[PDB]
Amino acid sequence: TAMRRIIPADMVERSRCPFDPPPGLLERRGQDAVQPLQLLNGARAWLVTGFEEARTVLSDARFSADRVRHREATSLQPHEVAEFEAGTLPPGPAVESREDGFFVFMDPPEHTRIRRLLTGQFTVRRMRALEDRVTEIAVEHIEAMKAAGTEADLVPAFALPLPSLIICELLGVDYADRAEFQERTAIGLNANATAEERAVASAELYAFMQRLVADKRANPADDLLSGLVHDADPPLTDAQLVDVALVLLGAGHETTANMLGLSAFALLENPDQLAALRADPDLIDNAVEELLRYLTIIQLGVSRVTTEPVTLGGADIPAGATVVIATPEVNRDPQQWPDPDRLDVKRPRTPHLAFGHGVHQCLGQQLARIEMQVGLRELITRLPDLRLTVPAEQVPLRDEMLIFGVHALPVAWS
Numbered sequence: 523t524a525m526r527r528i529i530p531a532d533m534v535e536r537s538r539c540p541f542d543p544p545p546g547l548l549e550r551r552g553q554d555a556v557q558p559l560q561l562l563n564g565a566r567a568w569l570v571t572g573f574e575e576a577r578t579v580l581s582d583a584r585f586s587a588d589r590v591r592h593r594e595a596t597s598l599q600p601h602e603v604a605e606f607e608a609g610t611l612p613p614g615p616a617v618e619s620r621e622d623g624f625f626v627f628m629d630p631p632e633h634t635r636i637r638r639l640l641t642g643q644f645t646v647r648r649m650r651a652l653e654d655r656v657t658e659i660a661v662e663h664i665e666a667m668k669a670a671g672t673e674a675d676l677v678p679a680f681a682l683p684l685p686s687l688i689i690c691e692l693l694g695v696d697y698a699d700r701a702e703f704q705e706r707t708a709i710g711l712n713a714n715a716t717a718e719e720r721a722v723a724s725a726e727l728y729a730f731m732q733r734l735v736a737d738k739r740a741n742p743a744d745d746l747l748s749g750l751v752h753d754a755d756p757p758l759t760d761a762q763l764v765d766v767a768l769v770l771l772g773a774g775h776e777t778t779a780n781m782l783g784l785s786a787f788a789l790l791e792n793p794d795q796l797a798a799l800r801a802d803p804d805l806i807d808n809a810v811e812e813l814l815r816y817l818t819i820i821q822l823g824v825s826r827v828t829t830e831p832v833t834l835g836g837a838d839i840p841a842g843a844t845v846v847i848a849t850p851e852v853n854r855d856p857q858q859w860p861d862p863d864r865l866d867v868k869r870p871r872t873p874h875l876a877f878g879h880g881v882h883q884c885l886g887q888q889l890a891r892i893e894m895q896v897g898l899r900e901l902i903t904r905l906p907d908l909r910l911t912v913p914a915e916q917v918p919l920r921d922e923m924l925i926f927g928v929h930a931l932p933v934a935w936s
């Protein structure tokens with residue numbers, strides 16, 4: 523169930539055009555907003571390209587996020603497709619039976635009970651604290667790049683480490699454990715790492731999270747994970763806390779890192795937009811929202827399953843169907859954004875779907891916005907005459923993974 527064994531290539535392959543929609547998404551423009559999608563495993567799903575239709579999927583009681591109970595077409599092993607199509611593939615476990623912390627695969631009220639504990643740690647006071655910590659880590663990384671020379675690969679020097687170290691801050695990873703943590707999270711994202719090298723790094727992090735939760739139970743500090751372990755009422759089990767720590771790491775690192783690298787890339791390819799930002803630093807917050815709309819690193823990973831038949835976007839979707847949001851095309855819906863394929867950091871700011879919608883809308887979105895606002899402000903103000911040192915078409919793209927991004931971003935400054 524690797525993404526490229528499931529999603530048709532033309533819906534995700536950018537070739538050497540990172541900012542342009544893949545041709546299979548382009549070819550659905552001006553058609554019904556919801557259309558069938560034939561998956562490479564032979565299973566059927568439905569694809570949503572409409573903004574209003576995507577909002578409905580993500581905030582309608584007939585579309586379930588419980589992808590444990592409701593099997594998705596995108597999850598099917600080859601031996602399971604004919605059972606799925608025949609309606610004889612069993613559901614996963616009923617949520618009443620589950621003891622795990624994977625609240626991402628739950629609907630209200632089971633979702634709500636765990637999501638409330640996490641919102642409870644993402645307080646406005648913690649967010650103010652994290653903005654200061656983001657500022658420190660960003661400036662330290664940029665000052666390190668400038669001390670080492672006049673050129674850098676922005677991905678390992680800046681885009682990967684800042685969000686990884688912010689996860690370390692949330693989880694209360696001790697200073698002496700950070701280098702190893704950073705190494706293991708980087709392996710996950712390395713083009714050159716084998717499936718065996720990855721599965722070892724993944725097992726090392728799972729065991730690390732178990733040890734980290736046990737350590738916060740014994741020796742709590744001021745971090746979000748200490749808060750979940752000690753201050754949560756009602757209390758989570760150790761197993762649930764491990765699951766929540768793995769969810770935060772999974773959700774908060776790769777996305778933010780890829781957004782930092784691709785945002786720097788887009789600004790260097792759109793010097794007029796970079797000029798607007800250097801000229802008026804107050805534009806940074808609106809610019810981050812435009813970059814989130816324009817780049818949409820989530821790709822086709824946002825899906826739900828119908829629990830009853832639904833008519834939407836010109837489609838009669840049956841019960842039990844997988845509905846995939848084409849988040850990059852939803853964020854280019856010309857009903858919402860005139861001239862949607864233009865990067866315009868001065869655009870009037872209106873809601874996009876880069877962080878999803880409804881009860882599961884990104885828990886980390888304020889923190890992600892802080893990382894982008896601070897990161898890009900510090901990069902643009904500290905690195906004069908920042909430039910790519912390879913042509914844009916030679917920057918290597920990550921379009922075989924669930925999250926889109928660049929593998930390298932070679933830059934220089936003066």
Ligand code: HEM
Pocket residue numbers: 625626627637692769770773774775777778781819820823824825875876877878879881882883884885886887889890
């Ligand atoms: C630019 C960076 C990011 C993007 C684009 C992003 C995008 C998303 C999206 C689209 C979802 C909704 C998925 C769905 O409904 O199926 C989501 C959920 C979530 N994200 Fe973010 N994310 C980012 C950063 C972060 C960060 C920094 C954290 C935490 C530190 C975080 C934690 C979460 C969590 C825990 C969920 C699950 C929420 C739930 O199911 O209730 N994310 N993210």
